[PDB]
Each structure stands twice: as C-alpha cells, then as structure tokens.
A paper describes a structure:
The conformer a of TPQ has essentially the same conformation as the WT TPQ (normal form), whereas the conformer b is rotated by about 170° around the Cβ–Cγ axis (flipped form). For both conformers, the C4 hydroxyl group of TPQ forms H-bonds with the highly conserved Tyr residue (Tyr284 in AGAO) with a distance of 2.7 Å and 2.5 Å for the normal and flipped forms, respectively. The conformer b has the O5 carbonyl of TPQ not directed toward the substrate-binding site, indicating an inactive conformation. The 180°-flipped conformation of TPQox was found stable in both the WT and N381A mutant. The two conformers a and b observed in the X-ray structures of N381Aholo were reproduced by our N381A mutant models (OXNA, OXTNA) within an RMSD tolerance of 0.577 and 0.610 Å, respectively. We noticed that the ring-rotated state of TPQox (OXT) is slightly unstable with respect to the state in the unrotated conformation (ΔE(OXT) = 1.7 kcal mol−1) for the WT, while in the N381A mutant, OXTNA is more stable than OXNA by ΔE(OXTNA) = −2.6 kcal mol−1. The energy barrier of the N381A mutant for the TPQox ring rotation (ΔE(OXTNA) = 22.8 kcal mol−1) is lower by 4.2 kcal mol−1 than that of the WT, suggesting that the process can occur at room temperature. These features are consistent with the X-ray crystal structure of N381Aholo where the rotated conformation of TPQox could be observed only for the N381A mutant. During TPQox rotation, the methyl group of Ala381 retains its position in the N381A mutant, indicating that steric hindrance between TPQ and Asn381 is significantly reduced because of the small size of the side chain.
Author numbering:
A (entry chain A), B (entry chain B): 9 to 628
Write the structure that this text describes.
Amino acid sequence: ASPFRLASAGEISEVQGILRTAGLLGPEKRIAYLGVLDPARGAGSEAEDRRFRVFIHDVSGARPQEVTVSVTNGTVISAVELDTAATGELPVLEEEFEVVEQLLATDERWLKALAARNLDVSKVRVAPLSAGVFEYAEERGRRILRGLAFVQDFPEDSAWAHPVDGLVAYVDVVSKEVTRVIDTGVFPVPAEHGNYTDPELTGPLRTTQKPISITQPEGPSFTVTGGNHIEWEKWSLDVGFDVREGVVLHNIAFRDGDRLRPIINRASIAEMVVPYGDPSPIRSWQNYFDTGEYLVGQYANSLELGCDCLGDITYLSPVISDAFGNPREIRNGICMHEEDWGILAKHSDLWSGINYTRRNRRMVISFFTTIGAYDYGFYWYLYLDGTIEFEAKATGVVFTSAFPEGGSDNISQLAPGLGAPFHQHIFSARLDMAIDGFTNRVEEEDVVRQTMGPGNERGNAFSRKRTVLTRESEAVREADARTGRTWIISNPESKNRLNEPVGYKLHAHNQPTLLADPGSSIARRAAFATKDLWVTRYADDERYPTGDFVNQHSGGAGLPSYIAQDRDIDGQDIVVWHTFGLTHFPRVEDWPIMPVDTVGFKLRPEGFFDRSPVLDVPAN
Amino acid sequence: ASPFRLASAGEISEVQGILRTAGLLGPEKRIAYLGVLDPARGAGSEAEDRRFRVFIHDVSGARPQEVTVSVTNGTVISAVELDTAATGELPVLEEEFEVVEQLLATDERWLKALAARNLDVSKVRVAPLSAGVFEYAEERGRRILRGLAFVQDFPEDSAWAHPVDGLVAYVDVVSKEVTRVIDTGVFPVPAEHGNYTDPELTGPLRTTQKPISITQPEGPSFTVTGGNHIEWEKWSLDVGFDVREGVVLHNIAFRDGDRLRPIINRASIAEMVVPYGDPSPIRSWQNYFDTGEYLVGQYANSLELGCDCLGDITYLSPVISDAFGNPREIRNGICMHEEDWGILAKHSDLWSGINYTRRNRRMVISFFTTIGAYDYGFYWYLYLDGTIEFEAKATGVVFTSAFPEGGSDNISQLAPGLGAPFHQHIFSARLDMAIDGFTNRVEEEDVVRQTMGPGNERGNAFSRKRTVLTRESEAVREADARTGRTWIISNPESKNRLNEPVGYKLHAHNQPTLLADPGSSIARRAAFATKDLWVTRYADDERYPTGDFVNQHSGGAGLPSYIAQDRDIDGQDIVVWHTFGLTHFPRVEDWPIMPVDTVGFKLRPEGFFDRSPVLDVPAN
Ligand SMILES: [Cu+2]
Ligand SMILES: [Cu+2]
C-alpha cells in the first residue's frame, strides 16, 4: 500500500512495455536512467499514480528523450526530445566503458604512442572518463569520453600501478571516432606492481586477530514492513533506492509520546564530484561527477555477511533497469542493522547517592558503490537521542599518474615513479526539511564574543546570535569554524513547552570546499561545491544541485539557477543542501589500496523535545 | 621490571614511610597530590630509580611542601617549602569539599539569606567550587572555596533541579571561616524535579530494545604483561595512571617488520578547564580546572561490566594515595578492549576481477570520572592502520541557575524558571612526540589555492604549503579550517623509501577556543586555551600547560612562560600541546540528565610507512 515502497521488478517490466509500445524503445535506444518519482505534495491522499521518469539515449545519433510514464495506468504522461548542447548530455552508459579502449586499439595515433613506449596494445586498459566542457567547439552537442591509459601485465594485475602519462585521447562514442590523441611526451611507466593479494607484497598474513562475535539472540529491535518501512526506537522512515542517488531516506519522523513528529521529508546524497588539481593537460579536465554523470546506485555492491556488514543484518535487494528496460536485482545491496554506541548518559551523584548509566545505540542504513578506482560507503545513522548523521567512507585505489622528475606541487609520490594527483571528493546532501511539518526556516548561529567592560566587568561573558535566512538570495552560506557556526532549521509555528520554536541543528565538519579558481569550468559546473550551505524553496523539479543532465553541461545549472529565483524561505517548505568533502593529498599509506577515510555531518535536536527523549531507556 | 609499571600499594606505603622518617609527614600533614615520575631521558644510565613527587598540605596553616622521594633508595631527593601566594595553592583536598556546607550551616548571614527564601538549611546543599583569582585581596595566600546553593527536597532528590540564585558564599577551608556572603536578591527556586529515575518523569520504560551481545570466544587479541604493557596488532605501549592526569599512555610504538618504531613517547590530557560565560556576580568567577585543581584521576569511577564497558574487557585497578599516604585502589578504573570498526579497505576492480574487503578494529583504553555535576569519559584509540585518536565524552547533569524573567544572552532555559549558564569544556593534550625517535620537527600544512593563468590555464590546480616551526617563539598556532590546516610532526633524519622524512599528521576538530576577553583572569590562567597548538622543547619540569599549582594561581607559569625561552624545536626533542573543546549552550534535551557529547583529535601516519601497513590483515 505505501506510495514510498521500492520499485518492483514488475513495475520496471511495465515501464519497458509502455515505452516499447509507444515506439520509444527501438533497437537503437538505451535507457540511461530510470527511476520512480516521489509522490507529489498534498497527496493528499489518494489515487496513487506510480510514475517513472526515464532518460533514453539513441546510439544512432537521433535526439535523446526524457519520458515520464504512469505504471498504474499504462500511459506515457510526457515525452520530450532533448537538445543536449543546451540542457546537457545523458549519463554515461555502462556499455560505453569498454568503447574507449576498443576505438583506440585500432587508431594509428594511439598505436604510435604505445609503440614509442613499447607497450603491447592488448595489455593497455583505458579508463572511460567524463569529458566536461573546455575549449573544444567541436564537442558541443556530441557525446564525448576521454581516455587515460593503464597497463595490465596479466589478467589479475592492478593496472593502477602502471599509468601511462603524457598521453590522452578523446572519443565520440556515438560516431565511433577518435577526435584527438594528445601525446605531450614519454614518461616512464611505473614498474612495481600494486597487487595487494600477492603474498610477496602482503608478507605472511597476521594470525593475531581473534574473532569478535556480534549477535542478537532475540533478533533486531527494528521492524521492517511493507518492504522498506522501518520502525526503530521511536523512529519511523522509509528506505528508498534510486539508481542515481543510491539509498534515499523518506519520511524521517520520531514518535514523541502520542504524536509522530516529522523531522526530514527526504534525505539523499544528491551529487558527489571528484575534481582533480593537476594542471597537466593530460588530467586538467578531469572532474568525475560520480552521482550526476555515472549514477552511483547502479554500481552498488552486493554486500557479504560477515565481511561487509557484521552482526544481525537485514538486507534490502533493490531492483533497477538495465539499458534495455529489463529489471535487475542488486542482491543484498542495502544493509540495515543496529549497533551499540557506547555510553548514552551517565552521572554518579554524591548528594542523591544515585549512580546512573545508560547505553546508546544507532540504526544504520548503508550501501557501498564502486566507480572505477573509487569505492564509497554511504552510511545513515539514527541515534536514540534524536541525532541523525551521515558518513561517507572513501576507499578503493588511488587514481594514479607518473611522478615527475624533480617533484610536483600538484601530485604526490606513492611508489617509485608513481604519482597521485591531488583531488577532492565533495558531496551534496539534499535535506528536504519537515521539522514538525513543512513550515520551516533556517537560522545561521554564530558564537559571539563579548568585550570586558560595563555589564561584563570580569570579561568572562560570551553569547551567540542567530540570523534568519529570509530569501534565497541571502541563503548561500559559508562555514566559520572559529565562531562555531551552525545552522538551525526550526518551525516558527510549533513551539516546545518553554514557548520556543522547535528546531534541529546542523553540525558540519568545516572541511575545505571546492578549491578550483572561481572562473574555472568546474567552479561553474559544480557551483554547489563552492559553499557549505544552501537553502531553497521546495520545487518538484529541483532535484540535483548540478541539474538534471550533468554530463558535458556548460555551467550554472542546478543550485545557482534555483537560488536566482529569490523565493521566500522564512516559514515555508524548504530544502537544505549541505556541501561537505575530503581534500586528498594522497599518502604512501594509501598505496596499493587505501584505508578508509571519512567525512559527514549530523543534525541534533535543538529544543525539539520538551526534555531528554531518552529518559525511558532501561538500564542495560 | 618495567620502569613504566603502575604504582603499587607497597610503593605508596613506602613513600609514606620515607616521608614520615624524614619528618615531613606528621599528623597535621595531608597528601594533596602523589604520583610516580617518569624515568629520566637516557636509561642506559643503569638500574631503576622509582621516584615519586608529592605535594604536602598542613592543616594547621603552616606552609606546604613539594617533595620528591626515591622509593627505590629510601631517600628524600628534594623538599621545598612553597609560598602559595606566589606560586599557587595546592590542589583541592577531597576532605575540604564538605567543609563549605558545614560552616555555612551556622553562619548568620547565610541563614538570613536562606530564611529570606523560605529554605530549610538542612535541605540546602552547597556545591564547593574552586575560587580562582579575582579582586579579593584577603584571599591571597589563603585556601578558599566558593559555594553555590541547591535545594534537595529529600535524600534521593537531584538538587541541580533547584538552584538558589542570587546567593554565593566564600569560605577559608583552613581557618574554617566564612569570609563573605553575597546576596544580590531572591530568585524563584525552580520547583520541577529532575529525578531521571522517577517513573513519573521517565514514563513506562521501553521494552523495545533487544540485546546486542558482543563476545570474543577465543579471548581478546591484545596481551597485557608486566601489569600494564599492551601489545596489540603491531602496537606496543604502557598504560599509566596519575591522580592528576588520569590515564597516561607511554612508549606508543608500532612494529613495522623487524623494527619497533616509536611514535609518541607520552600522551596525556594535561589540563582541562570549564569556563562559565554568565556575567552575573553569582557565577562570573566560575572556572574549574578539573585536572589541575581537582585531580581527575582521583575521582575515577569503578566501571561495571555490561553497562560501562561492553564486550571482552580487561580491567586495570590503579592505586593512588589517600590524604594520609595510605594506598587506595580504584577497582576497575580502566577498561581495555578491542572493538570492531567497520570496513578498513575495500575495492572491487573491473579490470582484474578481484573483489577485496577487509575489516577494521581499534584498541580502546578508557576511564570515566565524576566531579560534582559533571562526568567525563576519556578514550584513547589505536587503529590497525596506524591512526591514534583521543575522544572525550561529556555527560552528567547541567550546572544550573535561575532563568531570568526577561530572558538572557548568557543562559538558556531548561525547564520553567530553570537556567543553564553558557560555558565551555576545554582540554589540553600533551603529546611528547617521538616520531621514529626523538629528533622531531613540526610543520603547519595549509591548502594553497592557485589563480587561473599561465601554468594553470583551466584554473583547476591546487596545492599545499608546509611551514617549519623552528623556534618556540613561532610555535603558538591557531586553527584555519577553511584552508584545511593541519600540523605534521616529522623526523628529518628518518626517511621513508621514497626519501621523504617520516611523519604523522594531527587533525584537529577546529572547535572554538577560549572565548573570554583576553584581559580576563581566566584568559591569563588558562592562556593555553586561547590557541589551538603549541610546541615546546622537552623539559623535565614542564608538565602542565597551567604549571604545577593552578588553584588560586594567577598568570605567570605554564606555557606562556615556557615558550619565552625561545628554544630550538627544528629537529629536537619536542612536545605538542593541542587545545580542543566544546562550547555548550545547553538545550532542553540536556535536562534532566545530558546525553553524551564528544570532542577530540587524531593523528594519522603521513609517509611514516613505505606503503599501507595493513596489507597483511586477513579476510574476515
Ligand atoms: Cu581521494
Ligand atoms: Cu557543558
């Protein structure tokens, strides 16, 4: 019955059929994106109409389309041809990954470059990399991938150990042409392997680790109903999955006595971009929009009990489309479990004699994805005390280059002759807020230092200030760690027992935002990443901070275009977009496979409750 | 055997005997501090000489002494009479706390103030708080505590719910005189109780939480030898305990192949200060130095299996002195265990076909202390990958006031009429560095943005810069979150296989530092807390950032005096002092008992190893 249920295989098959019947899915067509649409505001509630949105590519050069279908009624709601030079190219297809290597393997410029370096073409892998928009007028409206080479000495070899620097190719994947091969000169190809399962490199495996057994003898404390509806320690939510965003949380609410109180209507990672900071022309174009260009959900891993998710795990197995509209299950793609989280609250009171300790726990909803060299874990946490947190875990293998003779200001050395270009991994969390319902506002809260003098004669006082963000033109905010800056989302029409608007406070990690020059292509295409916190008025067509079609879009799409409407956000239906990321200067320790590093954010109740919400937790 | 072993009951008794034999510990003497000293630099130097340092108070009003004893040799090494008006009072004696309420109960000014508020003196608890240094000239050379009153309605009542605002008293705890009673006028005493074990306030306890069982069927992976020497997953260290600092970690080192490589010689929390930001005269003096004034270690909790420390726990039970020099055990005061820590490293490689996942774990060493309303957990972590981390967990009951009828810029409201003055909890971690031995230096590393132009035509480049801190004058540093500022400790004489000095990088949380006006008493007394990072040259007598005697002590000692020496720190035996803290504007959710909030820091290897140090971890 839930309108927030996961897509079923049969709904995907029904989309396929509706498309093919309407003449929209001929043999030259490929589905680049397919997803369920969320219910509209003020449903309502009823006539449910399950709608799916689809992006259709044409491998013969015809114009692509965006198409919305109703699976409930068996109809095409809309179908629109796209002018890609205007609104952007469609996401990279998985079937295009191989095509760059194949086209290059019979190109005489490419063969010449390899022969100069004494590289067997059979051994040369080519990473299929997004192109962006630079100086090349011929690319506008064409679907281009760029290719960087890596040598694989044998089938189980890690090619990332052996980058071929000084060489890059550009290909048109529709016309099957190689438009450019650029060879700026020969760099040694690093020779050490990076095969982290070779005993020669690992040494003897430790035998010192004794097992840690995590079990739940009565099963888990959460319940899953309707496929994806979770109830756990007062929390209620629905776990969605979209092929672009991955795991999406819906209807996050907390049962406070008699009332189910909404907090967040929709939480997702709406974009994630990896800009590179090496000004070599071999790589200076490189910015991977893992979410917007590649679609992270579609590459979600199947997660293995005991290895990936430890304890008493409940899995979801979302269904997506392949390029032809057939459903495909991602078996065990989502892990759900509850974890112990140490001490929740503790006090040993001398006067009363009462010694009190309670433990904390968190509900975890996670998935893991792989985009080329990169692997990312996305984790959402709900705590007993009302805190909501997101954490990204970045691992995989470093995307490598040569290490230049005489060093580099933009590349670090991992192994002899093996470089790691500097880069960032920057995320955007889109939080469609619903603090006690939809009438919300955001304040920026700074600590305020006070001067010693009258009213503060000992010079000890300090305070804080809150500034309401009233319109979108005022709602593009930056961090200020030194003044303890946070942002509070409140409902001005819902007051706690002390007569203050109920709120939640966003605590950021205050990591650096996008470092690129503000006149750069990437600063224009990933404008969201240049600032920490954006607030918009909700609109059903404002989904991603980079717009709908990120691939080879010229710039300005998404948030800077939304914010330019200058809408009222003071007690309205609003969306917070928080930028957060890692700035990576890769270490020797990151090679030949990187230990996890993390980044995230959290939101804590701020006078949302009338007292602690965990007084009813029993002693352990 | 090990000179870093915990003090034994026999050693403490023997110090008592030595002091007695020397004429230093007659019946009017009290031990305000006793601890074992670390071995001197250079131990090739011959056998053990276990030395103890003692601060001896005299209840008859004679001057106190600082004494160092050799328990090995049965000797007094040094004994000096202190002039406390100059160099500071001794730490507060546990026995002095009760004195404040006792003396006030028969003081006619106090009784008049209570009668004005219709309070029964038998029901009035008095929090006995450190006095600091303000304008009261009669206090100079005297041991003063200040008292703030709270009503306890019955023996098991939480008195913190019922502050008595407008009243404060000052007491000389040696002469047993009430020096001042200040009554600025009656405030309503908040009436709502805060009894978080009362069913009326908790409601029915949850029955929803199913057990999480954490076990180690083959026992733990670490070994404990010599009472306190830990070996775990390549790590080696000794776990000390000092009544002032609490848990202290010694000789932190990592076994890399055949070589035991030092990293940190000594890690501790060398001070913590809790400044209050309410300019009322009732509280504007309020700042406690839990470590330096109270001695956090002495108030360490006994930790109970299953609620404090969950899993397969190995306890230490440190021994300290009582006020007479008799040994007293803190049973189960230190928890040691290893925890699963999610994914360590993961990559699914398209080209090779190899899918690889490994799990992480951390070793945890922890203790929990209570002083008055506050309860703090101090946690040290060692990870498989070489990361070292500290976390403080703040909980307890909020220290309350009245909430003024017209609101307040410096106090938040918790419950009707009940206020929570703004304050901070600020720690200093003293890290006596030994990165591959003692020849170390610190660099400040900032991200460097680059301008689009020649050499960077696409405007994508970014870099970083490192600035060596060469002398102590230049080594007092502040955070810059926006430029990703970190500090690298390296050994300029020990290079990795890529010919770069081995290092560790300190990652701070970049929270606000001390907020008080720089002209305040607290800004002088807690000068360390005004800046994020200090580096000194190692010296035997430079232990605490506030000096040896913090109680009622003005500026003049500690870090600003040390740094004046302007010593060479560029490839020398050096000590990093990191300030980090929480700034607390208490919420309604923090009442009537507060959920844990955290703050800390970590250090990660930075070209310390020649490649990832966890390639030898097996599949789970
Ligand atoms: Cu990276
Ligand atoms: Cu606090």
